[PDB]
Design a protein around this ligand. Sequence first.
Ligand SMILES: Nc1ncnc2c1ncn2[C@@H]1O[C@H](CSCC[C@H](N)C(=O)O)[C@@H](O)[C@H]1O
Length: 256
Amino acid sequence: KTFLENNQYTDEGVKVYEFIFGENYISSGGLEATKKILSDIELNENSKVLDIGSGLGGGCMYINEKYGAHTHGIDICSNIVNMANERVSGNNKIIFEANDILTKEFPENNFDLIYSRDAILHLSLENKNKLFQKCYKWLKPTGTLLITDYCATEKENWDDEFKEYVKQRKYTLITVEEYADILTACNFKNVVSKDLSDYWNQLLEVEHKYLHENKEEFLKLFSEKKFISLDDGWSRKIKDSKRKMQRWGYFKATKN
Ligand SMILES: Nc1ncnc2c1ncn2[C@@H]1O[C@H](CSCC[C@H](N)C(=O)O)[C@@H](O)[C@H]1O
């Protein structure tokens, strides 16, 4: 919690990410990607949804808007939850809670959809497995697990630059195939994994173009130093996704 709040997700860090990803988002593709990721998902006003790593709340906002579903977002960063809370009012079907998902308890057979977007990369391998075991219990018999997450080629293939990025971020990045195998080992059914690295590359390019075309505005809100860091960061993701060193994984599975 302290590592994340004092580094990657300081208040300013979150605002910089939001500038490039889009209002209410701090992960890949913002609203447009969310529309696509949820395009084949069916829920209604009676559905219960858990968003693991809910961030600024964009995903809960969209799911509630699209389906009328009850949404409950959990995020470990209290500053981010505070921001999320500031942007939703008068809606008793959107709840945000500051807590570590690894210690959170929910009733078994509780959720119609457990949803997570680029959050589980923060967890160690041991903790990814522990989390998915919890998710299995927490899903309703008829429920669905829906995840996007940063993945990577096998570690043996990483270059110096990518090693440094992963180290600095304290990410644990595994292959798409390894990730799918964890879900299978947790007894999820109908496990579908997709390597969406090409689509991710397209999303990164749109964001990179946006950053460049709105540089003046960015400099006013932030600084040239932060612009350079962001610009170079996206440049590396574009290069590394093109060559499949850094990947974007999509996973969907059911309890039965
Ligand atoms: N153990 C944990 N429990 C809950 N949230 C966690 C967590 N570890 C990291 N996170 C959260 O995961 C989020 C990743 S950023 C993505 C946020 C959101 N899903 C979106 O798409 O915009 C961060 O907000 C971070 O605080």
